[PDB]
PDB file of C-alpha atoms in Angstrom:
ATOM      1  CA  UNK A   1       9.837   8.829  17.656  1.00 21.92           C
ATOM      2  CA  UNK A   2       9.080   5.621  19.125  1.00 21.87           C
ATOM      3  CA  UNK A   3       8.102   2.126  19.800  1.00 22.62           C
ATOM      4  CA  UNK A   4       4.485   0.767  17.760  1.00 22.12           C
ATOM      5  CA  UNK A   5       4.339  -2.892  19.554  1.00 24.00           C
ATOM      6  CA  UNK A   6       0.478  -2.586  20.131  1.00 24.20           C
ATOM      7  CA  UNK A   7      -2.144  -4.277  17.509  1.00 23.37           C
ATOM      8  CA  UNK A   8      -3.635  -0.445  16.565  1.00 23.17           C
ATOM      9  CA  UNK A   9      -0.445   1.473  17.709  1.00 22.66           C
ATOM     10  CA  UNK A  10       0.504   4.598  15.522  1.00 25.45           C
ATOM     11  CA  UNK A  11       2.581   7.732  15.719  1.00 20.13           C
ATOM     12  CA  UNK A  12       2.123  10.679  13.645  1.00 21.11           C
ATOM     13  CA  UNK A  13       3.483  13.880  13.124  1.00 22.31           C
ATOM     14  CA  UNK A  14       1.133  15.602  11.088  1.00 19.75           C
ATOM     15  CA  UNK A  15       1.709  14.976   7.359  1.00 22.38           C
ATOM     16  CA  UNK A  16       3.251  11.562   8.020  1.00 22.31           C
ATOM     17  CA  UNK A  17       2.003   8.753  10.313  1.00 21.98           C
ATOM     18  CA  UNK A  18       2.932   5.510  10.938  1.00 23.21           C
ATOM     19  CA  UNK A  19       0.866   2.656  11.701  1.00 22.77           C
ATOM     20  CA  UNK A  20       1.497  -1.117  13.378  1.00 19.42           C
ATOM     21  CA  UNK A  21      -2.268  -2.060  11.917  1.00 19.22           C
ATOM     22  CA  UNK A  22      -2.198  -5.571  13.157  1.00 16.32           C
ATOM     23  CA  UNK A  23      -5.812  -6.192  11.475  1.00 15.90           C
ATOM     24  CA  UNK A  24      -5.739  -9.351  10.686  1.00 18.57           C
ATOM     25  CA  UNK A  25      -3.927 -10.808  13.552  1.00 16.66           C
ATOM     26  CA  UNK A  26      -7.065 -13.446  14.310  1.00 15.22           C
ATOM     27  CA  UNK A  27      -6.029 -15.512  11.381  1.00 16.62           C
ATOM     28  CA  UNK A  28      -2.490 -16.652  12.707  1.00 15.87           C
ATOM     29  CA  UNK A  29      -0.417 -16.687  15.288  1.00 15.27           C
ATOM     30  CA  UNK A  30       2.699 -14.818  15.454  1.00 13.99           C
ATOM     31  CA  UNK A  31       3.958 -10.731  16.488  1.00 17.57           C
ATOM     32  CA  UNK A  32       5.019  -7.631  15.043  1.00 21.73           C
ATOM     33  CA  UNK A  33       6.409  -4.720  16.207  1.00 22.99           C
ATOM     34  CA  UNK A  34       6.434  -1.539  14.086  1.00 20.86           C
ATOM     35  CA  UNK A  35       9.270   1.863  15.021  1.00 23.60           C
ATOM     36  CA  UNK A  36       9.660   5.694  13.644  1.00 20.73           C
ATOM     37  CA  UNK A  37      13.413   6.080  12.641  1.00 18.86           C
ATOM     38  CA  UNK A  38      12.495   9.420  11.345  1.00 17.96           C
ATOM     39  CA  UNK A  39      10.047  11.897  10.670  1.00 20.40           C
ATOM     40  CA  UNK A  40       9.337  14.996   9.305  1.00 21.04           C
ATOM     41  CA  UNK A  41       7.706  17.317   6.471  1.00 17.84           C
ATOM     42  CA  UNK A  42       9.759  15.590   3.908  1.00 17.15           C
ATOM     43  CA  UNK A  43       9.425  12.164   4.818  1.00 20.81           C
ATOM     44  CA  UNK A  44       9.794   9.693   7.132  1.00 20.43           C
ATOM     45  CA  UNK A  45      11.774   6.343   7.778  1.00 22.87           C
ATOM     46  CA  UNK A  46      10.297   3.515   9.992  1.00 20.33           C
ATOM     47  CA  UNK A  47      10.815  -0.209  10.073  1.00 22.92           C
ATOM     48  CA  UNK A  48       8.846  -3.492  10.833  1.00 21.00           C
ATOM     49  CA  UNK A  49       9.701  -6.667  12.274  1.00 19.59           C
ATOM     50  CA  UNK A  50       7.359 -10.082  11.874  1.00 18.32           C
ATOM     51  CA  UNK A  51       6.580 -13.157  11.916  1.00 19.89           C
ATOM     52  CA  UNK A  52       3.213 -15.266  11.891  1.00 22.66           C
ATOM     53  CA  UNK A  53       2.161 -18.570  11.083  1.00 21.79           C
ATOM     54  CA  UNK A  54      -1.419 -20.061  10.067  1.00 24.24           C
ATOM     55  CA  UNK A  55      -3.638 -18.768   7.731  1.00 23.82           C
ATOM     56  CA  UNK A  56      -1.595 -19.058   4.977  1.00 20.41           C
ATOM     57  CA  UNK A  57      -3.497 -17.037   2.464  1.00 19.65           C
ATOM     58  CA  UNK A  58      -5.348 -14.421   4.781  1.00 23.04           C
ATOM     59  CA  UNK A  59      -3.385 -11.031   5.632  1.00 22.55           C
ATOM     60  CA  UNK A  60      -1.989 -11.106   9.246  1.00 21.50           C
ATOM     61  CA  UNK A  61      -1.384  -6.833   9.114  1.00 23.84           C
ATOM     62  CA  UNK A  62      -0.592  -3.714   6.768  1.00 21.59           C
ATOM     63  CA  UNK A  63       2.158  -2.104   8.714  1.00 21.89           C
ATOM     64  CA  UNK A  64       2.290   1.245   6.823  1.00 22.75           C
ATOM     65  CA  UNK A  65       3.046   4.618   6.525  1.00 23.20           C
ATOM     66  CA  UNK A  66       0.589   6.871   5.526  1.00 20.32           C
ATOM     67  CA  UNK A  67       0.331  10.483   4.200  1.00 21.92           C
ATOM     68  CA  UNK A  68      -2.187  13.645   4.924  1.00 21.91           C
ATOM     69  CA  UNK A  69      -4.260  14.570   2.423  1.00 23.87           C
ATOM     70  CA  UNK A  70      -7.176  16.959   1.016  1.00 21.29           C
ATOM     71  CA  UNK A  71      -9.427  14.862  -0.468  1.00 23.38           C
ATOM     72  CA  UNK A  72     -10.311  15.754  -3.853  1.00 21.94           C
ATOM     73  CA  UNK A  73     -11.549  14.041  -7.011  1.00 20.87           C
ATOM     74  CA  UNK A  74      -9.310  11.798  -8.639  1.00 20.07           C
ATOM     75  CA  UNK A  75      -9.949  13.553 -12.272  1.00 19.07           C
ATOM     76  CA  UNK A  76      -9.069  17.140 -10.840  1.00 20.45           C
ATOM     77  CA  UNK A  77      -5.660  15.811  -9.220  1.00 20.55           C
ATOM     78  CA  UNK A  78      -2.064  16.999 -11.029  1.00 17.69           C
ATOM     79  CA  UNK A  79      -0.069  14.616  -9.492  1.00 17.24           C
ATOM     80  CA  UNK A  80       0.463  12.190  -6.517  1.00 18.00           C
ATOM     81  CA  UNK A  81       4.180  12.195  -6.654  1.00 19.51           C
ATOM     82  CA  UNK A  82       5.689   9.315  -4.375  1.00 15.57           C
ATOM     83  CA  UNK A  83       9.568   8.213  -3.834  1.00 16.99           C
ATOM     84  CA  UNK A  84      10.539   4.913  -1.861  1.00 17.70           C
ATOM     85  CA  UNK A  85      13.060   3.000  -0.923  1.00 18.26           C
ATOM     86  CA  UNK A  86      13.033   0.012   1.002  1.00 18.28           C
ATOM     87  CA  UNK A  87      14.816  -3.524   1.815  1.00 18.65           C
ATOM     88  CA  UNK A  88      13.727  -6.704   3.488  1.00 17.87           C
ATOM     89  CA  UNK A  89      16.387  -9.331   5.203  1.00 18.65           C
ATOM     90  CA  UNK A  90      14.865 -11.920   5.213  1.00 19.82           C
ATOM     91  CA  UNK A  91      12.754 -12.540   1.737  1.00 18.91           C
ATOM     92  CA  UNK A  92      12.057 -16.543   2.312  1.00 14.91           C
ATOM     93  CA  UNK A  93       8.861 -15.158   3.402  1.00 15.82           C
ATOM     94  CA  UNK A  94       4.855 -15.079   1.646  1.00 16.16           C
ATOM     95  CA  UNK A  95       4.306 -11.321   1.909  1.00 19.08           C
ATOM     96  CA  UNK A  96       3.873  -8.790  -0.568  1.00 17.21           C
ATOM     97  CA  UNK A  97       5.443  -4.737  -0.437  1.00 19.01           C
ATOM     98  CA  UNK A  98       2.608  -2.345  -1.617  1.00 21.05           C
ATOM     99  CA  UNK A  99       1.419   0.770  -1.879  1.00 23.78           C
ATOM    100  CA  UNK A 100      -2.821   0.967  -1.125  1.00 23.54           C
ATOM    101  CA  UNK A 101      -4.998   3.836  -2.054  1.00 26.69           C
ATOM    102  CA  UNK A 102      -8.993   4.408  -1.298  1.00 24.57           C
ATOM    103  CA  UNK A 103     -11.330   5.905  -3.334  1.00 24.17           C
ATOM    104  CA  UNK A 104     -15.049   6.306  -2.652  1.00 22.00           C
ATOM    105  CA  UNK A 105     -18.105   8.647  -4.405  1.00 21.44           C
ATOM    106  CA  UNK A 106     -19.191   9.688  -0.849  1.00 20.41           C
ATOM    107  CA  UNK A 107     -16.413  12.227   0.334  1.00 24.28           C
ATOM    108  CA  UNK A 108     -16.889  11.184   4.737  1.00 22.63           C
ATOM    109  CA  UNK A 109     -16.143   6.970   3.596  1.00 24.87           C
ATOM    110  CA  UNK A 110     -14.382   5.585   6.288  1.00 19.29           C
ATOM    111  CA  UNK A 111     -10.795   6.023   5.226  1.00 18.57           C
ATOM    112  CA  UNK A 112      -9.570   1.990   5.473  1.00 20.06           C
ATOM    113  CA  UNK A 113     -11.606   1.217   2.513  1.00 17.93           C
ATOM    114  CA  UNK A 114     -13.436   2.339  -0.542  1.00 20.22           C
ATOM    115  CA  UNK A 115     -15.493   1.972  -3.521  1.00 17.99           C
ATOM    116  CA  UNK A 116     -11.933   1.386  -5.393  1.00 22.17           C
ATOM    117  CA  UNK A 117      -8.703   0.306  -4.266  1.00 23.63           C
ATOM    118  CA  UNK A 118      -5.922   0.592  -6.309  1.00 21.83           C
ATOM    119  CA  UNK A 119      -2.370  -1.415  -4.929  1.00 22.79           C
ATOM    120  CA  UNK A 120       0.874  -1.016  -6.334  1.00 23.86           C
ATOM    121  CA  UNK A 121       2.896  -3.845  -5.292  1.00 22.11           C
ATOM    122  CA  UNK A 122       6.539  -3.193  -5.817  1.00 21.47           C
ATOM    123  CA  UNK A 123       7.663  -6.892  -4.161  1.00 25.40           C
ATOM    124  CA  UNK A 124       5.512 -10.243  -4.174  1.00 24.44           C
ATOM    125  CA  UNK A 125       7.563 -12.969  -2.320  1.00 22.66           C
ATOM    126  CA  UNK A 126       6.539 -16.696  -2.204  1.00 22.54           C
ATOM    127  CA  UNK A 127       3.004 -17.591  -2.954  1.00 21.29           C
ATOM    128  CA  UNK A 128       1.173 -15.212  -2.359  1.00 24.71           C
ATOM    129  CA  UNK A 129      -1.380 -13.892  -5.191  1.00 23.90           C
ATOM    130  CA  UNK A 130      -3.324 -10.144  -5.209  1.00 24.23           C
ATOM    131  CA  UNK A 131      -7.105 -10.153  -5.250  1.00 23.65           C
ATOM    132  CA  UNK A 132      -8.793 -11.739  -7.851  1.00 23.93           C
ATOM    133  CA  UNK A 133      -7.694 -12.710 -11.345  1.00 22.49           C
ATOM    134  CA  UNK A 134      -4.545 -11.314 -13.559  1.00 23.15           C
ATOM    135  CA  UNK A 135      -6.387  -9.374 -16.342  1.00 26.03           C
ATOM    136  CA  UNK A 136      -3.672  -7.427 -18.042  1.00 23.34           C
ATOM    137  CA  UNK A 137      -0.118  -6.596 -18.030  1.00 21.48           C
ATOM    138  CA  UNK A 138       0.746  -2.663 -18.615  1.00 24.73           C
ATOM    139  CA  UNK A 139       4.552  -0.882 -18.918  1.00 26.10           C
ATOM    140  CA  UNK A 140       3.722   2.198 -16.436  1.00 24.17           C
ATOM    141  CA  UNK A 141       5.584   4.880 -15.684  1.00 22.98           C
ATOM    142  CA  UNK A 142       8.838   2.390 -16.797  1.00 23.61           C
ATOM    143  CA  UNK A 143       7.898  -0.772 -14.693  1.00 25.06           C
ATOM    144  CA  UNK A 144       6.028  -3.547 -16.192  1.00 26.16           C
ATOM    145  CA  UNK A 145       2.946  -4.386 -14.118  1.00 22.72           C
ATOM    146  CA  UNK A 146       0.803  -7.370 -13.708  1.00 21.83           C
ATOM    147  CA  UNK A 147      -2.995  -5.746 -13.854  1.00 19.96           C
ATOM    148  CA  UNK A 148      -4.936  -7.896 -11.182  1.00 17.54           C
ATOM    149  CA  UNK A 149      -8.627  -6.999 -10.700  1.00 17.74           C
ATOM    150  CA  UNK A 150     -11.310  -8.371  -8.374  1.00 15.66           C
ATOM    151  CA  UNK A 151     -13.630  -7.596  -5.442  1.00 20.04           C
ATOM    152  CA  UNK A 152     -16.995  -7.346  -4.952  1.00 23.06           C
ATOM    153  CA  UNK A 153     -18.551  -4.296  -3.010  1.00 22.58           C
ATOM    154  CA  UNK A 154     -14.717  -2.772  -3.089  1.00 23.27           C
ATOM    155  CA  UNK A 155     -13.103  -3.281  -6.299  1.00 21.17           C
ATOM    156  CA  UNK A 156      -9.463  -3.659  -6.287  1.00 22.89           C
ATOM    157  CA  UNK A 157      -6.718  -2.663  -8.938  1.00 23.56           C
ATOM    158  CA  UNK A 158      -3.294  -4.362  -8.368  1.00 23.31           C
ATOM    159  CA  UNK A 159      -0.493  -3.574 -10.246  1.00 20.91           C
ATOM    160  CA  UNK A 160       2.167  -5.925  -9.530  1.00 20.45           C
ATOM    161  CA  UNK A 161       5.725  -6.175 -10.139  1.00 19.82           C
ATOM    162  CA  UNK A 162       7.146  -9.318 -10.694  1.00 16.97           C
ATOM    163  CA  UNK A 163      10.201  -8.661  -9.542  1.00 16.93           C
ATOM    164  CA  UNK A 164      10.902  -6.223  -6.442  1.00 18.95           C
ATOM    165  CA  UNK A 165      11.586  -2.713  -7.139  1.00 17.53           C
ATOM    166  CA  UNK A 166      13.342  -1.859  -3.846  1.00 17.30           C
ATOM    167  CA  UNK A 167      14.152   1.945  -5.088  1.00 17.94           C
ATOM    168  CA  UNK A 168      10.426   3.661  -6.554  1.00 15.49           C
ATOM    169  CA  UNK A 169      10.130   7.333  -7.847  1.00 15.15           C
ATOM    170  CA  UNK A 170       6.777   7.949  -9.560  1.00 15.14           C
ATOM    171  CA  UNK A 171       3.468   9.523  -9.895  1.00 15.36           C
ATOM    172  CA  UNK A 172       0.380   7.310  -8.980  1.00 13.52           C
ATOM    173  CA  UNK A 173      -1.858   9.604 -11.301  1.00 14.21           C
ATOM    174  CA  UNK A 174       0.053   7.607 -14.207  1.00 13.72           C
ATOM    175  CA  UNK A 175      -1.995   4.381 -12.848  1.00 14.77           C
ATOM    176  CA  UNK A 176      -5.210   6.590 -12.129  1.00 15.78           C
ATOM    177  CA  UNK A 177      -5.031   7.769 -16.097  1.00 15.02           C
ATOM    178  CA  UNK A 178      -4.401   4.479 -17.342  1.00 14.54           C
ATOM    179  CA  UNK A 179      -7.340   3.084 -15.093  1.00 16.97           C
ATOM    180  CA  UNK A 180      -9.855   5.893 -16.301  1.00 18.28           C
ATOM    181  CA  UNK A 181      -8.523   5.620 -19.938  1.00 19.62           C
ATOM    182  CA  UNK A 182      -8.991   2.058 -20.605  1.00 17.56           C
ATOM    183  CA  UNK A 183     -11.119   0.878 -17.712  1.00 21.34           C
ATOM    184  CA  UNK A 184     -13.795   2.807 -17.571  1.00 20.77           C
ATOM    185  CA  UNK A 185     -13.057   3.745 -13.791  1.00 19.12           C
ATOM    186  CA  UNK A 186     -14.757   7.035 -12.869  1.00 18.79           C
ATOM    187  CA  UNK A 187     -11.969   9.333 -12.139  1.00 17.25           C
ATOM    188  CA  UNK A 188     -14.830  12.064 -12.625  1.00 19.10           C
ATOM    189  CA  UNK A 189     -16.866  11.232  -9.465  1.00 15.98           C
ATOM    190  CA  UNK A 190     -14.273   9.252  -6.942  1.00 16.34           C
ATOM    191  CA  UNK A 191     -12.422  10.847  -4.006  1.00 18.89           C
ATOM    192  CA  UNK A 192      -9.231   9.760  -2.969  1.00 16.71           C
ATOM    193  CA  UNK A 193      -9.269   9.316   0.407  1.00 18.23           C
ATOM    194  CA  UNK A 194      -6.393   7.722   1.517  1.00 17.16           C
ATOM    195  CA  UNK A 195      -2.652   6.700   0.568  1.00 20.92           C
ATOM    196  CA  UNK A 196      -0.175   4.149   2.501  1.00 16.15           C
ATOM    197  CA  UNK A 197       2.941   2.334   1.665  1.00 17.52           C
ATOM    198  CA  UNK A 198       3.376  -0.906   3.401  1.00 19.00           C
ATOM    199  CA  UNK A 199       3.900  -4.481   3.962  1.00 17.82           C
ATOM    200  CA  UNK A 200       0.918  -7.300   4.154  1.00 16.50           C
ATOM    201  CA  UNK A 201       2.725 -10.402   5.553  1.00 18.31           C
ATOM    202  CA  UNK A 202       1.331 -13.848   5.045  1.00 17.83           C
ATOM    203  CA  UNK A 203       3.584 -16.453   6.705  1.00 20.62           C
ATOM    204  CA  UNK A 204       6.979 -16.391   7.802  1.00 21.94           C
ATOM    205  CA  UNK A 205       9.324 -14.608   9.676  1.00 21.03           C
ATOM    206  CA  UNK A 206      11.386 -13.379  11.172  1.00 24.42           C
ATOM    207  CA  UNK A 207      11.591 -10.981   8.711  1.00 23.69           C
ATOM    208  CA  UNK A 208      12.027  -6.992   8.998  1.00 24.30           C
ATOM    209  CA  UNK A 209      11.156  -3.899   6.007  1.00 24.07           C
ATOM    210  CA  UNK A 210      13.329  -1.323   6.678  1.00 23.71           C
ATOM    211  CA  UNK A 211      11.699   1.837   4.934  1.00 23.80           C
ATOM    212  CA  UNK A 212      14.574   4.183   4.802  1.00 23.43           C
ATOM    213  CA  UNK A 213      12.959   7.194   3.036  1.00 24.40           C
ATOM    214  CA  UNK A 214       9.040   7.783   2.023  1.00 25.32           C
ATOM    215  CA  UNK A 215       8.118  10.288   0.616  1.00 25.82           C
ATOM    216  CA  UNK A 216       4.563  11.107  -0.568  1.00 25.36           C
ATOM    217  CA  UNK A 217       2.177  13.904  -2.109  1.00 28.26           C
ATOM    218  CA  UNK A 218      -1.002  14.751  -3.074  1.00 33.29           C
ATOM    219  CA  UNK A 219      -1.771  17.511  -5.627  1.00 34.03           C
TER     220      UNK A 219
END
């Protein structure tokens, strides 16, 4: 496609889109630019280039792609099958590479948050921490995750890998059934509503994620 310099700048194709999403560019100083490499029904390549200063433990953006969806309750889903892989160049950086899902009881929430938010974090680099406090650690789908868990009006569900998993293949309804099996979360009345795979930069830079294949579906 092409060039995604601008704070809210974005490209889409239909199924995929891609998104600069410099939100929290007040707490820093610093750029980013974000580009399509490729794009179609079965997936889509884009990279991201960064670096900010300041701030050092607020979010400076969640460059991400993001996939189409009919929104549906998270107990009647099959499967949300999702393959990655990715690489940074420069990892003497504070940023983290995750995947971030919304769910909310009323179906029209605004799709950039939710009731729940669950985060898959297949990188953590520097010091960076998730929200709130570690409560668990889980083997999922053949990763071992750090649980995190914290938030107020949105609750957030971080699984974290402690070290980066740069090539991902699996189904995000394994982390849904462990979260409605053993933490009470109510699959039964919660819509997912959204689903992006990104990079939340703290400080440092320059540093680029080069996304070479995401792919991304829910059933």
């Amino acid at each position: 496609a092409q060039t995604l310099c601008d704070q809210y700048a974005t490209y889409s194709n239909g199924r995929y889109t891609v998104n600069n999403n410099l939100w929290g560019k007040s707490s820093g100083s610093g750029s980013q630019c974000t580009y399509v490499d490729s794009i179609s029904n079965s997936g889509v390549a884009w990279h991201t280039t960064w670096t900010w200063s300041g701030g050092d433990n607020q979010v400076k953006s969640y460059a991400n792609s993001q996939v189409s969806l009919t929104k549906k309750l998270v107990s009647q889903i099959s499967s949300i099958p999702t393959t990655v892989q990715w690489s940074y160049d420069n990892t003497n950086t504070r940023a983290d590479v995750a995947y971030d899902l919304f769910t909310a009881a009323d179906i029209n929430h605004v799709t950039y948050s939710g009731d729940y938010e669950l985060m898959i974090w297949l990188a953590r680099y520097g010091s960076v921490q998730p929200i709130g406090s570690q409560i668990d650690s889980v083997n999922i789908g053949g990763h071992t995750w750090e649980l995190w868990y914290g938030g107020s009006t949105q609750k957030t569900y971080s699984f974290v890998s402690a070290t980066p998993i740069t090539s991902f293949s699996g189904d995000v309804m394994d982390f849904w059934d462990y979260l409605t099996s053993r933490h009470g979360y109510p699959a039964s009345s919660q819509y997912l509503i959204n689903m992006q795979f990104g990079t939340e930069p703290f400080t440092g830079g320059p540093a680029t994620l080069r996304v070479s294949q995401w792919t991304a579906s829910v059933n």
